């Protein structure tokens, strides 16, 4: 019966069905473009046709005279409000509407307000703009050249930025971590050494639902309400208040249902600011919803890292040192989402799952005539890059030593007894058990049989296909929080939760995070359910409304379970401590004479004497025990003591068609360990989604630019997104290594599948060519690009 009562809760560990499904499966979800307000007008944006050039003149008359058009605003209308530029999370400034010149193609130059989106589109076509083209900067290396054109004329004469000194006009910053002296010394004396250059191409999160907002400033009440596709509504509110002068309490930002974010919706885009301004000016609602081409072309991109990795080791394979140098392309304006003190995110986590004694990494940011971004698409703040770098280097080292790729990892892994482990870069890994997981994966796929099949195939020079085996053993770092080192525009990276129990036993809870499909409305309810003995089904959770939810930092970097999940458990526990106190008063015994059993406090010894949470809730409203306030609720803001470090072990087997360059994923096995699991069903869905993004990135995605800086393949015509046919069947597995410092031992996990799968795909592809001396092949592993390599290494046909 105690087990029956626990089961009935549908709390921690259960694979319960989602509470939010009902509305979505019936078309009753509420996304930004579903909103219609009285007197709502529509906005469209006139975008730059060229990548770089001065603005001679903008013709507004033809558009203005067009029936149905209410206004055409340019940067000149934004100047009095000091809004033609806006601060970015990276400490730089970004143009809202191009003023003296355009820095990237598709950049926002002007806006039009019309009766609807149809007339609005027509108005944009009627707005003519004259430009004087300037030479375009596309390659980061060419950008640092002495004679390179000045992209940021607004930064002229400056010698420093928000992240240190600047050595050139197109140089943004240089950041490093680790011991350079020690590392240099190791490499100088190391017996075995390897070094590889690799490009992590620029790709785009491309959420199915694009960015948008319905901005409504009410001149009567003097306040602003903005429904927006934001992954951080509370900071947006704080920023919007600052930039507009409207007192914060009078600004209400609400993230309704969002059709996927994937890091694309963390920052503030020029479209939002313009809509807000237009609404303030016209005194009525203004809706802005971008098209797919605008989303890919101008919203936050991911990656674009040019990396030079080096590994020092001994002949038996033990890694002695790690040295990395990177050139980062941040586009025209540095709007890279990151905690204020990390211009390159947590890239210094590149020591991986290995006990490397010495290490150093240096990252150099550079401006180019491209759209801003860098941190998005499940990157965990440059962790995607760090893992790709280390895993690729380990593979190169293994190939040079003719050492098995799994064996070199097992030998270098941080051991279970070394946790909490402090790396050469300073991170304190919370817990792990990499060895156990590796063995589990290797046995499941029969690794030795795989290697033997591969050996038998390579032996036959007439085999029509190449067999590749990729293996990645990674360590993630998620839960951006310690306010001491992590902050967004000055706000510490904590999070919160408020829970209120009603007189009849059910409850409502609000957090500072904001789901975009990851199931918080179900999972958050489960955490609280186990903490209070109230079925998750009646614990109603909400997020996204700054006027009702406790202040939080939103959801990105898989911080929800680590940061908010902790605040949820702690807020529930405050309520539990009061409930024990009330139960003791009702049972006329002392608190210490009580035992909590699933959903009730029972007197030690006598089982018949007990009080449920329902009984306690009513008592709290009926008559509070002496010294206590009526009610049963709690609030908690959690400033995390450390990050959470989930891990994984992925293996991919691929077969490459030698006649066409086509790569077919034969099998993919993914083991993730994110500690205590809240809902296995929901975790599985996150993994499936992340592995699919991984496949898309490694095998088909890219954002090429021609010599004139025009973005090629910025629509679904060429920008790769796999369908059910291209997506392989995923095999998942797991282990449970709890985070010691977390209230419920739960680590984040949503980005792990993306971070780890990308290098697993490259590993498998390169491994297919390893026997002919191939150490690396840059993504995407397109049939076109792979065929090119087949031809280079005489393996075609």
């Amino acid at each position: 019966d105690a087990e029956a009562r626990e089961l009935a809760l549908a709390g921690m560990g259960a694979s319960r069905l989602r509470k939010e499904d009902a509305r979505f499966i019936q078309g009753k979800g509420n996304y930004v473009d579903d909103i219609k307000m009285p007197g709502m007008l529509h906005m469209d944006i006139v975008r730059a046709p060229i990548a770089h050039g001065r603005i001679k003149k903008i013709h507004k008359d033809a558009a203005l005279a067009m029936p149905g058009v209410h206004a055409v605003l340019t940067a000149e209308d934004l100047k009095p409000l000091k809004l033609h530029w806006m601060p970015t999370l990276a400490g730089d400034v970004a143009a809202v509407l191009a003023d003296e010149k355009v820095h990237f193609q598709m950049q926002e130059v002007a806006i039009v307000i019309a009766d609807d989106r149809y007339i609005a589109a027509d108005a944009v076509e009627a707005v003519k703009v004259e430009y004087d083209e300037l030479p375009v900067v596309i390659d980061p290396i060419d950008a640092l050249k002495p004679d390179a054109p000045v992209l940021r004329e607004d930064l002229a004469g400056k010698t420093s930025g928000a992240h240190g000194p600047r050595e050139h006009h197109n140089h943004i910053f240089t950041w490093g971590a680790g011991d350079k002296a020690a590392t240099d010394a190791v490499f100088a004396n190391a017996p075995v050494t390897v070094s590889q250059h690799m490009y992590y191409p620029r790709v785009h999160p491309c959420p199915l639902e694009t960015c948008g907002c319905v901005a409504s400033f009410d001149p009567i009440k003097g306040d602003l309400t903005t429904y927006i596709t934001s992954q951080a509504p509370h900071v947006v509110r704080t920023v919007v208040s600052m930039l507009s002068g409207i007192p914060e309490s009078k600004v209400r930002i609400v993230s309704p249902d969002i059709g996927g974010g994937f890091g694309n919706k963390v920052g503030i885009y020029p479209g939002y600011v313009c809509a807000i301004v237009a609404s303030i000016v016209l005194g009525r609602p203004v809706k802005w919803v971008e098209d797919r081409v605008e989303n890919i072309s101008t919203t936050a991109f991911a990656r674009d890292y040019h990396m030079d990795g080096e590994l020092a080791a001994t002949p038996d394979g033990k890694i002695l040192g790690l040295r990395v140098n990177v050139v980062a392309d941040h586009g025209a304006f540095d709007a890279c989402a990151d905690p204020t003190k990390f211009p390159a995110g947590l890239f210094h986590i590149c020591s991986g799952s290995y006990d490397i004694p010495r290490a150093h990494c240096s990252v150099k940011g550079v401006y180019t005539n491209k759209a801003p971004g860098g941190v998005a698409y499940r990157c965990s703040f440059r962790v995607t890059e760090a893992v790709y770098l280390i895993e690729r280097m380990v593979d190169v080292l293994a190939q040079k030593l003719n050492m098995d790729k799994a064996e070199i990892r097992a030998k270098n892994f941080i051991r279970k007894e070394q946790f909490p482990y402090t790396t050469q870069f300073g991170f304190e890994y919370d817990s792990g058990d990499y060895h156990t997981a590796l063995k589990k994966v290797l046995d499941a796929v029969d690794y030795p049989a795989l290697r033997a099949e591969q050996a038998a195939r390579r032996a036959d020079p007439n085999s029509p296909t190449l067999m590749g085996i990729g293996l990645v053993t990674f360590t993630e770092v998620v839960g951006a929080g310690p306010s001491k080192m992590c902050d967004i525009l000055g706000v510490g990276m904590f999070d919160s939760c408020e829970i209120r129990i009603h007189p009849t036993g059910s409850a409502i809870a609000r957090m500072g995070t904001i789901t975009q499909g990851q199931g918080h409305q179900t999972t958050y309810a489960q955490i609280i359910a186990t903490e209070l003995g109230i079925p998750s089904e009646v614990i109603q959770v909400e997020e996204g409304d700054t006027s009702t939810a406790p202040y939080g930092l939103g959801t990105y970097g898989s911080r929800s379970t680590p940061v908010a999940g902790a605040a949820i458990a702690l807020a529930a526990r405050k309520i539990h401590a009061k409930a024990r106190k009330i139960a003791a008063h009702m049972l006329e015994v002392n608190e210490n004479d009580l035992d909590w059993e699933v959903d009730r406090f029972k007197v030690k010894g006598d089982d018949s004497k007990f009080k449920t949470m329902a009984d306690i809730a009513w008592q709290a409203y009926h008559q509070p025990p002496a010294g206590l306030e009526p009610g049963l609720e709690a609030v908690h803001y959690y400033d995390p003591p450390n990050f959470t470090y989930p891990f994984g072990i992925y293996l991919c087997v691929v077969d490459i068609d030698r006649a066409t360059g086509e790569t077919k994923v034969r099998r993919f096995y993914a083991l993730d360990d994110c500690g205590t699991r809240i809902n296995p069903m929901i975790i599985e869905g996150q993994i499936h989604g992340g592995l699919t993004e991984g496949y898309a990135v490694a095998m088909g995605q890219q954002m090429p630019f021609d010599a004139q800086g025009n973005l090629l393949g910025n629509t679904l015509m060429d920008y790769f997104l796999p369908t059910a046919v291209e997506t392989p069947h995923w095999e998942t597995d797991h282990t449970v290594t709890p985070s010691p410092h977390h209230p419920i031992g739960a680590k984040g996990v949503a980005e792990s599948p993306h971070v780890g799968s990308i290098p697993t795909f490259t590993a498998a592809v390169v491994d297919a060519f390893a026997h002919v001396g191939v150490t690396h092949l840059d993504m995407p592993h397109t049939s076109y690009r792979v065929w090119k390599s087949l031809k280079e290494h005489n393996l075609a046909l």
């Binding site: 639902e209 249902d257 996927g260």
Partner: protein
Amino acid sequence: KKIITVNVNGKAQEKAVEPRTLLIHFLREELNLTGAHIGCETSHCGACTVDIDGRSVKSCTHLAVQCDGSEVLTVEGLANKGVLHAVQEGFYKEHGLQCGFCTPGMLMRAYRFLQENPNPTEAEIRMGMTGNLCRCTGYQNIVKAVQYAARKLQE
């Protein structure tokens, strides 16, 4: 403007429409049937899929005016008297949705595909759902959702 009469979810709708009005906007803006979504301008995503005269069609590449005398079914019309359709139940039971943006289109497609092929193999399902993109699920649970609906429809 052309006056048309479209049967949407069993109810006749006589409206005056501009020829250039895409069916997706007519449904979302004029009728407030906001289940159908927009995810692209090139006709790839399928988040706008609705059933028109017995067939799955991407409403973003069809004009509202062409629907004069047509029978259109949107996700809001799937449930019968509040009882979920097998495809809605399958997606729910098998966790075939996350952000829910591609869901209405996926459901409308699955609704017709299961009539085109009642006993589909996994390969046939993946191929039969090729016109619909999803960024969240990785498709695996969607295949299971459709399989669940197939079993319930022949029950």
